[PDB]
Design a protein around this ligand. Structure first.
Ligand code: CLA
Ligand code: CLA
Ligand code: CLA
Ligand code: CLA
Ligand code: CLA
Ligand code: CLA
Ligand code: CLA
Ligand code: CLA
Ligand code: II0
Ligand code: IHT
Lengths: 151, 104, 174, 170, 69, 139, 169
């Protein structure tokens, strides 16, 4: 038995069909991620990706930022997450302006309207996830430490 | 357990090759084939009169009693855990090779 | 095609009404992750072990065997495990149940391949299921008591972790 | 949201009426969200004590609610012909053969839910400043004249513009 | 220090056993050459007896280490 | 004349050195040739492939990759029956090499000389005379 | 087959064979010659049957040449080891003589030699079954007797008729 074959039956394309690239587990994970999941509008793809990314962004800024030993550490960490979010949304918008011609198609990610939808959803979800992380850390003393409250 | 020994799932190790990972049999057989020899006792301060599997399982229970506190650098847990999982992974690798490849 | 036990969920795809103890209960989709036949063999195994565990809890309250009180003084439910690892009892049951598990492992591989039904070891010496009308009743009944005994075993051992009394002594001394 | 608010509105009125046996000796004189904080001060994890009252509620409500999660996810993507709010719960026959109910009874449910959202918000904030609870507040139609000393909640910051910016009659 | 013992007939016994063991086992396993009367020559005998003194020396030293002798 | 798209390709196990997204959106090149044998050659993009007896066909990203394989087969296996094509994403196929049926190093009638300068290289114009003028430096 | 009913029949063994009970869970008869497996089972049983008596009788009566040690097991550490070397080579001579130079799986059974037979006779299927089952019993018996004499350090019958102390190590 052999586990490495030509990609999509084509021996001359610049890829290989390896277990990491094309196993059932990989295909299940890739097909179910919000970027590739079927039946989702680009705005909803943006919302789910944004909620995920905004939620984890809060933590490194809060724990390791300049005001980390102050009592405004969570405030500074959230606002730093917000600043990164605003800069990244500017990056997404300028990518959309320069990469896609204007056509009526809006249900695919790689169209002008579909990218604008994804950017709108990504900003809303990102600020939402950062806000949710702020609420959770604000209220639960376990999250404020690294779990160090138990010791 | 992404695929059992019986021809039931469609899990393909790659794009078009189905391959039965024998996760129940290999995991069970490798565990028993590694744990049973490892029961051999030894009057060494790391083992304490037990085998490596039994001293390891004892150090799991001892550190779980003090549940939030982690075991210290000089604690025997880390060396028992390392050697145990090293030989366990080696026996899973060799068992998967033997069972999937030779099939008997 | 809606789940019987959970009316607002779609009926589980891997599950079927031919299975004994079926109620349409898999809201998390675990019947798709692992093979359903492995899950049935695992469930029936858990069922029988917990049935023994629960009856043993009750009986070890009700009486003890001759000479047992010599070896176990005050240890009641899981303390007897701790004192009888020192004595040879736990090593003995571990050795002989592991002996049985070797052939159980062969039988699990066989039932994965498809030759054997899960939990079926042909152990019917008193011929209770010979008629086969009872067989199906016994099959569903065994699964129900097994599930109840899993919950009960957990609920007694946790009642003993709380009070130390053990099941019957918890009940009689409220 | 409407159903949870309706339970909350009913709970506040009943808690003012009476309490179950033995509760008064544990919580003391706490009503309408102060009892939430009081229980949480005596529960493992959040506080230090021998209770799991809010935690047991969280456990079973969360089990039911992961089940409803799967229902909402399936209903969103069109895999199910189930309407909103219908979980099939109708043990005594009220809709005469359909658990979904009649058009009029779901209209009754939705309007009473909206009413209870408004009402439970009102009851919560009137307690947060007077400390009286529903029936004392509704009896005490001249209010701020004498108010109950009640603890700061688990979010005191929100009570920081009441003093130096807003009037703070209390 | 691990305890070794002066030569006795038990040491001779372990050596002889390992030696015969390696003759028979080697006779089957060796891939290039009447169970022992077909194709048995001096290099096969000398190789099986060299592995016999290796297995035997290891067996003698280990059984002296643990106390079996 | 036109590329018969159905020609079987040399047996190959695949590689990462093959063509990328620019091949299906800008241009791809194809090479066909006849082999008397079923023999191993080296791909311009990577490891080894085996050419099938009869007619073979490859797709490469660069024209130079097609010509590097063509020189390799001609020297190693004495095969000169190679035709190189350019293929556009519209489906249109452009025959490339040898351009008029005859190899470039062999002369042919009807070839018109392009790029030929009537004087020697030192007779070019200095840059100053042709500054702010469109006139070319080649005289 | 019949012994372990929740497994398949081995289908390499049959009721023709003497001590057959349909008991082959691991499928050992699929990977080795069954003639060799039968030959090994009977010979291992015959050595074990001598070994049981070899553990029982020297308690009551030990030869005047030797010293008996403490238990019939431990007696191999007190008799001269050259004596057991001749035991080993004499049994090897018996192996090379009774088997006519054939000492390997490919080599045995060349002339149609039946597994049990070394030329002492031909027996009924029942008689061969009796031999096999007594051999299996004496194989299990040897392990119990030997380990009992090991841990207790007492003679088997001295332990049995005297206080039946648990085996401990
Ligand atoms: C998972 C189950 C389990 C476990 C771990 C234990 C563990 C223990 N028990 Mg409990 N016990 C059990 C089940 C269990 N028991 C059951 C099912 C009963 C009977 C209702 C009892 C009744 C019992 C008593 C009365 C006593 C113990 C005692 C003990 C201790 C020593 C072992 C002993 O003497 O057992 C004795 C147990 C038995 C003889 C019951 C065995 C029941 C068998 C296994 C059922 C199987 C029957 C079936 C026909 C076999 C088919 C095989 C199949 C796989 C093919 C120990 C802490 C002793 C102790 O220290 O208590 C303080 C003691 O006095 N047990
Ligand atoms: C693992 C569990 C366990 C343990 C530790 C013991 C331990 C003991 N048993 Mg008990 N016993 C057990 C299970 C156990 N038994 C079971 C399952 C049975 C069968 C039902 C018996 C039946 C039994 C009898 C009938 C007697 C003992 C006796 C004894 C004691 C020996 C005393 C003597 O003089 O002889 C010893 C302390 C004897 C004794 O003196 O105890 C009262 C005795 O007469 N045992
Ligand atoms: C197949 C045969 C077999 C054999 C030879 C033994 C041998 C022994 N068992 Mg085990 N045992 C077996 C099967 C067997 N067991 C099975 C199938 C079970 C059920 C799981 C157990 C469960 C068991 C328990 C729970 C205990 C023993 C104990 C003992 C010891 C008894 C010592 C003594 O004084 O004996 C004389 C007593 C009798 C003959 C009583 C009748 C000895 C190591 C005891 C011990 O100390 O463990 C090491 C003990 O507590 N046995
Ligand atoms: C067959 C299932 C079963 C049964 C009959 C019981 C029955 C009992 N348990 Mg156990 N329990 C179970 C399963 C079960 N439990 C499981 C699966 C768990 C999870 C680990 C627990 C964990 C548990 C703990 C932690 C405690 C109990 C307690 C109790 C007792 C009082 C009931 C109570 O307070 O609930 C209240 C019921 C309601 C509020 C229903 C509405 C009662 C004897 C309590 C007790 O008094 O024991 C010391 C106790 O503290 N049980
Ligand atoms: C989470 C809320 C809460 C809390 C903290 C308590 C706390 C208490 N209750 Mg109450 N109770 C509650 C909810 C609560 N109850 C509810 C929802 C009901 C159901 C209607 C009851 C029904 C109830 C009864 C019927 C009684 C108590 C009693 C008690 C006290 C028990 C003293 C004792 O020895 O136990 C002994 C009692 C039991 C173990 C079980 C009864 C204790 C202070 C008892 C009391 O007043 O003690 C002074 C009493 O008789 N409770
Ligand atoms: C059946 C007879 C027998 C017995 C009882 C032993 C027993 C032993 N041998 Mg020996 N050995 C044997 C046969 C035997 N061996 C044979 C046939 C060979 C092949 C020639 C060897 C070759 C061998 C070598 C080369 C060494 C041993 C060593 C050891 C000892 C330490 C092993 C250890 O814990 O390291 C654990 C080490 C680890 C890394 C574990 C993780 C151990 C007592 C070692 C020793 O210390 O001798 C003093 C050693 O150096 N043995
Ligand atoms: C000169 C010695 C000698 C020789 C050449 C043979 C030859 C044979 N014997 Mg015999 N045998 C002998 C002595 C010998 N035997 C003695 C003294 C015993 C003990 C009473 C046995 C017990 C015996 C049994 C029980 C069996 C054989 C079998 C066989 C056959 C296959 C194995 C083989 O080729 O040899 C390999 C054997 C030897 C080189 C000598 C064996 C003596 C034992 C095993 C001591 C070994 C110690 C050590 C624990 C071995 C483990 C290795 C490792 C852990 C270090 C072959 C006909 C097997 C068969 O199927 O026969 C048809 C079979 O089942 N023999
Ligand atoms: C009690 C166990 C027992 C039994 C039932 C048998 C039975 C048999 N053996 Mg086996 N055998 C045994 C012990 C036994 N033997 C032992 C210990 C040895 C080692 C010395 C041998 C070595 C041996 C060889 C080398 C051969 C046999 C053969 C045979 C068969 C003889 C064929 C024949 O004439 O048919 C009729 C059968 C008989 C007349 C057998 C009578 C049974 C005897 C007399 C057992 C009596 C036991 C007696 C109480 C002695 C106790 C002494 C002890 C306390 C020291 C027969 C199936 C031959 C054969 O064909 O293999 C199948 C063969 O070649 N046997
Ligand atoms: C559905 C179902 C069933 C069921 C069930 C259950 C448990 C149904 C429960 C229904 C309930 C509990 C409804 C309660 C609604 C409350 C409202 C509308 C009030 C809001 C308050 C206001 C406006 C106010 C106010 C106030 C202000 C702000 C200031 C305050 O100081 C005081 C004051 C009070 C005056 C059953 C089990 C029979 C089965 C069946 O087959 C299916
Ligand atoms: C347990 C816990 C606590 C708690 C708590 C709880 C239960 C808090 C609940 C708070 C709620 C539900 C507040 C509701 C506010 C509703 C408003 C402002 C309605 C506006 C409607 C309008 C303007 C309608 C306008 C209109 C009308 C009239 C007519 C025209 C149309 C329309 C536009 C619809 C804490 C946080 C206090 C802490 C404590 O330690 C732990």
């Amino acid at each position: 038995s052999q586990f490495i074959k030509p990609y999509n039956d084509d021996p001359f394309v610049g890829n290989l069909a390896t277990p990491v690239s094309t196993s059932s587990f990989t295909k299940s994970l890739l097909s179910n991620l919000p970027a590739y999941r079927a039946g989702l509008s680009p705005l909803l793809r943006g919302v789910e990706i944004g909620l995920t990314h905004g939620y984890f962004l809060v933590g490194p800024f809060y724990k390791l930022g300049p005001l980390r030993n102050s009592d405004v550490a969570l405030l500074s960490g959230f606002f730093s997450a917000l600043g990164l979010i605003v800069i990244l949304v500017a990056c997404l918008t300028i990518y959309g302006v320069v990469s896609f011609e204007e056509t009526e198609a809006k249900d695919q990610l790689q169209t002008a309207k579909g990218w604008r939808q994804f950017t709108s959803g990504w900003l809303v979800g990102s600020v939402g996830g950062a806000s949710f992380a702020y609420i959770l850390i604000s209220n639960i003393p376990f999250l404020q430490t690294a779990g160090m409250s138990m010791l | 357990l992404s695929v059992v020994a019986q021809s039931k799932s469609d899990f393909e190790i790659s794009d078009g090759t189905p391959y039965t990972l024998n996760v129940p049999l290999v995991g069970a057989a490798s565990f028993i084939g590694w744990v049973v020899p490892t029961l051999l006792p030894s009057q060494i301060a790391l083992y304490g009169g037990k085998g490596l599997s039994t001293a390891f399982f004892a150090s799991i229970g001892t550190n779980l009693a003090k549940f939030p506190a982690p075991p210290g650098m000089t604690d025997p847990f880390w060396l028992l855990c390392f050697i145990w999982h090293s030989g366990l992974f080696a026996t899973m690798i060799l068992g998967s090779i033997g069972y999937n490849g030779y099939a008997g | 095609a809606m789940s019987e036990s959970v009316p607002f969920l779609k009926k589980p795809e891997a599950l079927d009404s031919s299975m004994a103890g079926y109620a349409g209960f898999d809201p998390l989709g675990l019947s798709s992750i692992a093979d359903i036949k492995f899950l049935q063999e695992s469930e029936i195994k858990h069922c029988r072990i917990a049935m023994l565990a629960a009856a043993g809890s009750i009986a070890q309250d009700i009486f003890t065997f001759p000479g047992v009180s010599k070896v176990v003084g005050t240890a009641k439910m899981t303390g007897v495990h701790d004192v009888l690892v020192k004595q040879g009892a736990m090593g003995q049951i571990l050795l002989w149940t592991s002996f049985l598990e070797v052939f159980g492992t062969i039988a699990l591989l066989e039932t994965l391949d498809g030759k054997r039904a899960p939990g079926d070891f042909k152990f019917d010496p008193l011929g209770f299921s010979k008629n086969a009308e009872t067989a199906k009743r016994y099959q569903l009944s065994e699964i129900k008591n097994g599930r109840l005994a899993m919950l009960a075993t957990g609920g007694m051992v946790h009642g003993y972790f709380i009070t130390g009394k053990g099941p019957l002594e918890l009940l009689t001394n409220f | 949201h409407g159903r949870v608010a309706m339970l909350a509105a009913a709970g506040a009125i009943v808690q003012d009426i009476f309490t179950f046996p033995g509760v008064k000796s544990v919580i003391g004189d706490v009503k309408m969200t102060s009892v939430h904080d009081k229980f949480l001060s005596m529960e493992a994890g959040s506080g230090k004590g021998d209770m799991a009252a809010m935690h047991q509620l969280l456990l079973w409500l969360g089990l039911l609610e992961i089940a409803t999660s799967v229902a909402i996810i399936q209903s969103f993507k069109g895999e199910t012909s189930r309407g909103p709010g219908e979980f099939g719960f109708d043990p005594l026959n009220f809709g005469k053969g359909n658990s979904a109910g009649s058009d009029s009874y779901k209209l009754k449910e939705i309007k009473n839910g909206r009413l209870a959202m408004i009402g439970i918000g009102g009851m919560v904030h009137h307690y947060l400043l007077t400390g009286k609870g529903p029936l004392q507040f509704l009896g005490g139609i001249p209010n701020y004249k004498s108010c109950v000393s009640h603890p700061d909640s688990l979010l005191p910051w929100l009570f920081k513009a009441v003093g130096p910016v807003l009037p703070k009659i209390c | 220090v691990p305890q070794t013992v002066a030569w006795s007939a038990k040491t001779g016994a372990v050596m002889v056993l390992s030696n015969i063991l390696c003759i028979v086992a080697g006779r089957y396993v060796i891939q290039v050459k009447s169970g022992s009367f077909a194709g048995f020559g001096l290099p096969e005998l000398l190789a099986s007896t060299s592995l016999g003194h290796i297995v035997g020396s290891g067996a003698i030293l280990g059984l002296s280490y643990v106390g079996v002798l | 004349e036109t590329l018969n798209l159905q020609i079987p390709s040399p047996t190959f196990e695949g590689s990462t050195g093959g063509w990328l997204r620019a091949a299906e959106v800008e241009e791809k090149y194809a090479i066909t040739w006849t082999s008397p044998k079923e023999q191993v050659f080296e791909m311009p993009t990577g490891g080894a492939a085996i050419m099938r007896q009869g007619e073979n066909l490859l797709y490469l990203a660069r024209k130079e990759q097609c010509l590097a394989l063509a020189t390799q087969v001609k020297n190693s296996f004495k095969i000169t029956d190679y035709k190189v094509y350019r293929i556009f994403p519209s489906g249109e196929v452009q025959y490339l090499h040898p351009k008029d049926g005859v190899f470039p190093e062999k002369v042919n009638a009807g070839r018109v000389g392009v790029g030929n300068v009537s004087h020697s290289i030192g007779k070019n114009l200095n840059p100053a005379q042709i500054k702010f003028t469109s006139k070319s430096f080649n005289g | 087959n019949l012994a372990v009913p929740f497994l398949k029949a081995p289908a390499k063994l049959d009721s023709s064979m003497p001590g057959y009970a349909g008991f082959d869970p691991l499928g050992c008869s699929d990977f080795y010659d069954v003639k060799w497996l039968q030959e090994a089972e009977i010979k291992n049983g015959r050595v074990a049957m001598l070994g049981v008596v070899g553990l029982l009788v020297p308690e009551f009566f030990h030869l005047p040449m030797y010293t008996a040690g403490a238990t019939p097991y431990e007696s191999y550490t007190t008799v001269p080891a050259f004596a057991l070397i001749q035991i080993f080579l004499g049994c090897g001579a018996v192996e090379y003589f009774t088997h006519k130079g054939k000492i390997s799986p490919d080599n045995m059974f060349d002339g149609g030699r039946v597994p049990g037979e070394f030329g002492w006779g031909k027996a009924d299927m029942t008689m061969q079954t009796k031999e096999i089952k007594n051999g299996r019993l004496a194989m299990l018996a040897f392990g119990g007797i030997l380990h009992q004499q090991l841990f207790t350090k007492m003679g088997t019958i001295a332990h049995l008729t005297g206080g039946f102390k648990p085996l401990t190590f």
